[PDB]
């Protein structure tokens, strides 16, 4: 389904956003990419020669690669969703034709995470302030209260009165999270998930000041949650509450966070303030 976005509520595909110049931006962008992934993005950069896949062209509807992407125009209208869609065929078509366990399965979703990563960046330029002193105040709180919730926290907040009754209000979904799997008990983790994260490491990274920028801690705190779903089968428990946990700090960031900046700076009683160093290299 070329149609179904991987996340049909993601901001990528809800917000009418463009990037100006997007066709410069999508080649600058798939490059950097290629020379710092390499091992990773190598199998996607090419369609596989029609000569030896046969079943491959018989199964794929439609074939996908980074190269095709790179030759294509995307600077009209609905070019940022036909860019994403494509983008996310590296993933779906690899996912249809390979076995979902697979490590060239993983590696195409890697591909699609770190692609849409620097997309999610780009397109939130205006809003991408520094962290100065008092937007990391607020950060961290927001941080703690990701790590604080409980299912029916979570719950209330998402589904208000639609909330399921009785939902547990001790364990807190951020457990698994925190700290990275010990390396010599799952080596094969470390074989699958290329970009690991946890939160306690994010959260140490917040609090000592190596975030620039407010997306550069997001995308962190998006890569724990994604990677969950990259090494888990779809049906583990871990898995749901990667996706819950995603979910919720979503609404925190777009419902609490950034509405409590704006209004902190109508008041006066917050700068926001821009780095922006590379900003429109691609240009």
Known sequence: DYNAPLNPKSELFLDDWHIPKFNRFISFTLDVL???????????????????????????????????????????????????????????????????????????????????????????????????????????HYLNKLVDATEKKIN??????????????????????????????????????????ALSIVKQNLEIGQYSKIYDFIIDMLLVFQNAHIFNDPSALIYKDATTLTNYFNYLIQKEFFPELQDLNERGEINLEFDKFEFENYL
């Open 156 to 197: 209330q907040a998402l589904l208000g009165a639609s909330s399921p009754k009785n939902l547990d209000d001790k364990v807190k979904l951020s457990e698994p999270f925190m700290e990275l799997v010990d390396k010599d008990e799952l080596p094969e983790y470390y074989e699958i998930v290329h970009s690991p994260m």
């Open 34 to 140: 290629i020379d710092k992934y390499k091992d990773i993005f190598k199998d996607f950069i090419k369609l596989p020669s029609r000569k030896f896949h046969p079943q491959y062209y018989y199964k794929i509807q439609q074939p996908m690669s980074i190269n095709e992407i790179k030759s294509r125009d995307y600077e009209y209208e609905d070019g940022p969703s036909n860019f994403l869609l494509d983008v996310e065929l590296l993933t779906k078509n690899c996912q249809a034709y390979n076995e979902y366990d697979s490590l060239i399965v993983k590696n195409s979703m890697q591909v699609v995470m770190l692609i849409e990563f620097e997309v999610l960046k780009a397109k939130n330029l205006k809003r991408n302030y520094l962290i100065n002193s008092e937007v990391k105040a607020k950060l961290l």
